[PDB]
Amino acid sequence: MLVNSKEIVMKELLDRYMDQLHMACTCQVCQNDVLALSLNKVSPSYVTDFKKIAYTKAELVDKQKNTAMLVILAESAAVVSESPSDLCQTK
Amino acid sequence: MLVNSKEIVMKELLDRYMDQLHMACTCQVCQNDVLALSLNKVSPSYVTDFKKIAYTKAELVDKQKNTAMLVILAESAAVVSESPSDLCQ
Ligand SMILES: [Zn+2]
Ligand SMILES: [Zn+2]
């Protein structure tokens, strides 16, 4: 299967560090918006071997690399918090 | 709900030019390699609404832009052909 390994990384960081990103709404819509803003800000890393995504995801341990990504998510989270899409929860 | 629109463009362009790229193997595995190498050389364009990906397939039918992307396809095609993944055959 054809998949950008950065999307796997983000989705993982987003789920693990959801609370420290301080989102106004946590519905799937708002979450997808954060992901999209963030994935459009990192260089694509498409692969075809699931074993290869495992290697990438492992390289971004709790120590070292993940912080730069958490910062982009947080930043994107701010934007979605203030300017939510019309497809989000309403009333 | 979460797709890179470039992915929708490259797939549509590949299955319109695949038989012109002089690819060594044309199995799904090598096709994925081509798409992956190509997707990695263009800027991501992630979307969340379904209304964009539908019309995105129409404004890619327009040219000049896809020409730049065709080149990419072809350049990706040469690499995959020259060095096929061991998941192919
Ligand atoms: Zn929401
Ligand atoms: Zn092949």
Author numbering:
A (entry chain A): 1 to 91
B (entry chain B): 1 to 89
The publication says:
The comF operon encodes three proteins: ComFA, a DNA helicase and two proteins of unknown function, ComFB and ComFC. In the present study, we characterized the late competence protein ComFB from B. subtilis in vitro and in vivo. We find that ComFB is an obligate dimer with a dimerization interface highly conserved across a variety of bacterial species. ComFB tightly binds one zinc ion per subunit using an unusually-spaced four-cysteine motif.
The final native ComFB structure was obtained after molecular replacement and refinement into a higher resolution [2.48 Å at an I/σ(I) of 1.98] native dataset with P21 symmetry and four molecules in the asymmetric unit. The four molecules are arranged as two dimers, each with two-fold symmetry. We observed an anomalous difference density peak at the position of the hypothesized Zn2+ ion in each of the four molecules within the asymmetric unit. Three of the cysteine ligands, C25, C27 and C30, are closely spaced in the primary sequence. In ComFB the fourth cysteine that completes the binding site comes from the C-terminal tail, residue C88. In the ComFB crystal structure, the C-terminal residues beyond C88 are largely disordered, suggesting that C88 binding to the Zn2+ ion helps lock helix H4 into place. One type generates homodimers of chains A and B and C and D respectively, within the asymmetric unit, burying a total of 1550 Å2 of surface area (for the A–B dimer), with 11 hydrogen bonds.
